Symmetry: D2
Subunit: 115 residues, 4 copies
């Protein structure tokens, strides 16, 4: 995958499973154009979002749906998504794994960018 | 302070000093409208951004400039900003502190929301 | 303060208040000698742990008590403490803030080391 | 795998490759006894550390060597290790993945525990 997204639930110590993810690419105007979407697997991963040729250079936003992920815990999170923006392929071709460790009011997110 | 932003450099273990912070609010033509801005202090803190009156319920984005903050390190970051989005005042008025611990390819943020 | 510890609850979005903190300094024998302790304030902070005189060069462990912090959420955490180890004043005189953002199965810590 | 460790370099945005990891278990005399060790792969991962039968309930410390990992960056880190302590299995046999996103003066760890 040129791009994969990993989501972990830092409250329960588990992959975040069957969580909706939206990817956008910043358009000519300021706007976020829909790029790819899906839901995480049993390992918290979302594979197969894009291909090398559709994954052109640009600014990408990854939005992970969180609003009600937390509901069973009794907590409303800081925002209905966890989002991370990254600038891609601006020096040539690269695989990106976006790793998110999520809590209702905190998250850590790392971009692992390889050959 | 209804809204405070605190920025830490996780690479050198210090406050991120004199860093530009721009706050936006989602405008409902769905664009981000400029809301407040400032530069972090010697303690990495940014106070005085808004007033309990301007600071209504809504969706806010805190954009921390990092385009060149890493330059002396010789690393170009994952993105030219660090952004944190939060929904405010979904249930009455609150003080928000957005704490961002930053690295070039990572970051950890917690929103601390107090009722005072 | 030569040493202060600040604890945030990443689940609830609030300072972690009245939480026990233990500080140790590594002895001659590999043993952790107790150094200072307390409970966090209403701001999640623990001030007044040490004096610049008592804060001699060495390896320090900060242990934040988390075992039952989470009890009301119905979650038992990964460990009964959140712990961070740092090597101190290896160059002169310096003030440390140890900042911990805590969830049951994740934490982020950073050492802010000044002047 | 009962215990897997995955290390990411949060400064460069890559897997931390060929990094030494030592695992310890809290022993009878309150010391840390050596329990397993290895080096991270090209994916930042360390598999094969232990066996279901070796990995009994207890308190485990994962120590990641970071003494010179940062040297080329010109920064000496907060400590010569990144250590994560967890209380294993405390409810029956589980698989553990300890994910550590590392910077010189910070870190985020997450324990993923799966049944
Ligand atoms: Zn894949
Ligand atoms: Zn969605
Ligand atoms: Zn959003
Ligand atoms: Zn800006
Ligand atoms: Zn203020
Ligand atoms: Zn941006
Ligand atoms: Zn303790
Ligand atoms: Zn103090
Ligand atoms: Zn070691
Ligand atoms: Zn394995
Ligand atoms: Zn150590």
């Amino acid at each position: 995958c040129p791009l994969m997204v990993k989501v972990l639930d830092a409250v329960r110590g588990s992959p975040a499973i069957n969580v909706a993810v939206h990817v956008f690419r910043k358009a000519a105007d300021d706007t976020w154009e829909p790029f790819a979407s899906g839901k995480t697997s049993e390992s918290g991963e979302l594979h197969g979002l894009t291909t090398e040729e559709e994954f052109v250079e640009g600014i990408y936003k990854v939005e992970i749906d969180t609003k009600s992920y937390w509901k069973a815990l009794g907590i409303s999170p800081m925002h209905e998504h966890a989002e991370v923006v990254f600038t891609a392929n601006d020096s040539g071709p690269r695989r990106y794994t976006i790793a998110a460790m999520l809590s209702p009011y905190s998250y850590s997110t790392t971009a692992v960018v390889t050959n």
